[PDB]
Amino acid sequence: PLESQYQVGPLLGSGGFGSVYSGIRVSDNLPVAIKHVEKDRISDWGELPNGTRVPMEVVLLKKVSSGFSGVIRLLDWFERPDSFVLILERPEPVQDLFDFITERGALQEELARSFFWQVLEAVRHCHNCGVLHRDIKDENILIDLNRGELKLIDFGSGALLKDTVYTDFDGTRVYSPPEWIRYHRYHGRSAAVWSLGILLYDMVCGDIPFEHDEEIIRGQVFFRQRVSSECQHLIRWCLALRPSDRPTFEEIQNHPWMQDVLLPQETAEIHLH
Ligand SMILES: NCCNc1ccc(NCCN)c2c1C(=O)c1c(O)ccc(O)c1C2=O
């Protein structure tokens, strides 16, 4: 019922997460994305309500796929003998933040503020549904170029949210917090805030702040680009070396630099049309 119900198109990308293709639902022509994951490469399984043995990503996507938000929704999934196949929303036209930043360089603050806010709403939404993404970064964010709406995408290093320590990590090194580098332990929220700090610097400087472990552990931020006596404060706060010194989501969103965010539509009008 799978190769009948959807019509495959060009490969969107591939890497550690598997292979994703552009697709159309035949039922009606909904653009979709078709994600193939191989059973051999899934380190980490879960189980649905009705109690079947699935990749965690599916658990996590199912928990966050209710209602609207800034998360790309699991429409359906299939099992095959050696692979699981996931069908996801596909905005049209779309561009991931990595390519966007790669093309246009450092982002004007107003646009960064709008993007950053929407990520924060998306991650709040996830933390709310009991899900922790664990790999928030430019290439896990899609931009709907028309609506100016950001969407989070790759839940395959994700985990159920919990208040005790984590001692496994699969996201990107350069995005990992110092407490992971030094101790191989972190807590969810504060590790997410650190990665959000990395993300924001990226947005406003066109590039990530830290390359090597020693830089992360030293946690000292140099700005290669002009950036406001404010955006630099928020960034450094999120990148505090001690987890307990980082802000909560609430504090990030009440920070002066986060005031007067544009709505997504006016964001696209001004900055993407
Ligand atoms: N700029 C081209 C972006 N291509 C992707 C690369 C990796 C990738 N996987 C995770 C990145 N690490 C995805 C995509 C998608 O375009 C995409 C999409 O257009 C709609 C829905 C999607 O889920 C993806 C998606 O998961």
Give the domain CATH number at 124: 1.10.510.10
Boundary (domain end) residue, out of 92, 109, 128: 92
Distance CA 252, CA 7 (A): 42
Q: What is the DSSP letter of 257?
A: G
What was the experiment behind these coordinates? X-ray
Distance CA 185, CA 166 (A): 6
Q: Domain check: are 86 and 97 in the same one?
A: no
Q: Domain check: are 79 and 100 in the same one?
A: no
State if residue 94 touches ligand 1 by the CB under 6 angstroms criterion: yes
Q: Domain check: are 137 and 269 in the same one?
A: yes
Q: Domain check: are 99 and 4 in the same one?
A: no
User: Resolution, rounded to a tenth of an Å?
Assistant: 2.7
7 has which bridge partners? 24
Specify the residue with its C-alpha closest to ligand 1, atom 17.
33
Hunting for tokens 């990665």 — which residue is that? 195
Boundary (domain end) residue, out of 62, 92, 122: 92
Q: Domain check: are 247 and 145 in the same one?
A: yes
Q: Domain check: are 66 and 101 in the same one?
A: no
State if residue 140 touches ligand 1 by the CB under 6 angstroms criterion: yes
Q: Domain check: are 241 and 130 in the same one?
A: yes
**135 annotated active-site:** yes
Total domain count, the chain: 2
Long-range contacts of range 251-259, CB-CB < 8 Å, 24 or more positions apart?
252/120, 252/193, 252/196, 253/117, 253/120, 255/230, 256/230, 257/109, 257/113, 257/228, 257/230, 257/231, 257/233, 258/113, 258/116, 258/117, 258/234
Classify strands 141-144 and 131-132 as parallel, antiparallel or unpaired: unpaired
Which residue range forms the structural domain that includes residue 177? 93-273
Boundary (domain end) residue, out of 67, 92, 117: 92
Q: Is 14 annotated as a binding residue?
A: yes
95 has which bridge partners? 143
